[PDB]
Each structure stands twice: as C-alpha cells, then as structure tokens.
Structure 1
Amino acid sequence: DIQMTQSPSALSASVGDRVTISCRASQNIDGFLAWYQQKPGKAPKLLIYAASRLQSGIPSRFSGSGSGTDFTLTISSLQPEDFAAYYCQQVYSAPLTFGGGTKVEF
C-alpha cells in the first residue's frame, strides 16, 4: 500500500516564526491527504482536509498546499499552542497509512 513519511526533521523555531513541513507519498494519491496536529496526551486535530481548503475550527495561519505526491503545510506565525507533532495520512487507498511526523518545539 501507499507509505507516508515526513521529510523535515524537528524544528525548534520560536513563537512568531514562519515554519513549513513537507509530506511525500510513495505513489500518487491525487489530492487525498489529511494534515493533523497532535499535542502530547491529546487527540489529533485535522488541520487541512484534502488540499487548499482549511478545516473548520482551525486557525487561518495554517495552510494546505501541494498536489499529487507532494504535499506541504505552512504556518504563518508560531504560537505556544501550535508546537506539536504533525502527521499526514493518505486517503486515496482503502487501507490508511499515517505520516512519520515532525516535532515542532519552541
């Protein structure tokens, strides 16, 4: 099945600094990816569904980008709430694979 990994390593940018993670699919899943934000000891929160369109109840700073295999997420400004481990899942296949994840720290 499709395998999802996140290329960037842990980034310790400070509050108010723009950050960008990259998620790469093994094979083309079209626009079927879901970006998540999981705080430790907390349920994951889906940042962007598919591509471009932000999920409801998610702050405007989070953005959805990338078509085909390549997918990307950009945060305009950092905050204490924002720091977390982010994960991306392919939705094109029937079995679902989740991204390795990138840690975000102050």
Structure 2
Amino acid sequence: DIQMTQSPSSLSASVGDRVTITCRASQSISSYLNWYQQKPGKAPKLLIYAASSLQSGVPSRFSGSGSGTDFTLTISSLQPEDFATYYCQQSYSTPNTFGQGTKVEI
C-alpha cells in the first residue's frame, strides 16, 4: 500500500524562475520514481524516469533528483509553455500510485 505526499500543492511564479517540487516516499523506492507533466486537456506526458534521466525533447530546465524517500523536481527555467501540473509515480511496485499534483502557474 505505497503512498506519496507531494508538496507544494499549487504554485505560481515568473518566466525563467526556479521552481521546486518534493515527494516523500512512505516506502523506500531506491530511485524507482517518475515525474509526469500534463497541461490541462492533455495526458500525463512523461518528463523523467528513474528519478533523473530525462527523455528527448524534455526541455533543458527539468532536473529530477533524489532517491529512497525524498525526490526533488526542479524546473529551474520555467517558461510559459511549461505551465501545467507536475506529478510523481513509482514504477517500483504494483499497484503504482501517482503523486497528488503540484500545479505550476504562469
């Protein structure tokens, strides 16, 4: 029964400004965590697996860190295309369980 608090829950900032996100793992997941992004009316379109390694196109400013319990989702150059809700998922165990959503504002 794996569970993710993710804070903060709902944000707002300015173009090109550092924005930072957390998730604490009820359970140690090694590095077995994903971060999803999904603008409104769209689907989770993945930014990062195993904690950090991105995937192509994923613009330069997305930087996933941490392991075990505490992960950290820096978007450290927010731009206006980048506004949306950002999320955590373990692939660790099944059931897999999403984070519960920090929504960036531009």
Q: Normalised by the size of structure 1, how large is the TM-score?
A: 0.93
Separation of aligned partners in 1, 2:55 and 2:35: 10
Report the RMSD for the aligned CA atoms in angstroms: 1.1
| Contact 1:63–1:75 (CA under 8 A) maintained in structure 2 | yes
Offset, 1:30? 1.1
- Gaps of at least 5 residues in structure 2 are none
The AA in structure 2 aligned to 1:85 is T
Residues 10-60 of structure 1: CA deviation (Å, up to 9, x unaligned):
221011111010011111111110000010000111111112211222111
The AA in structure 2 aligned to 1:74 is T
User: Which consecutive segments of 4 or more residues in structure 1 shift more than 2 A?
Assistant: none
| Contact 1:47–1:62 (CA under 8 A) maintained in structure 2 | yes
Count of equivalent residues: 106
Partner SS, residue 66 of structure 1: strand
- Gaps of at least 5 residues in structure 1 are none
- Percentage identity across paired residues of the two chains: 86
**Which deviates more, 93-102 or 47-56?**
47-56
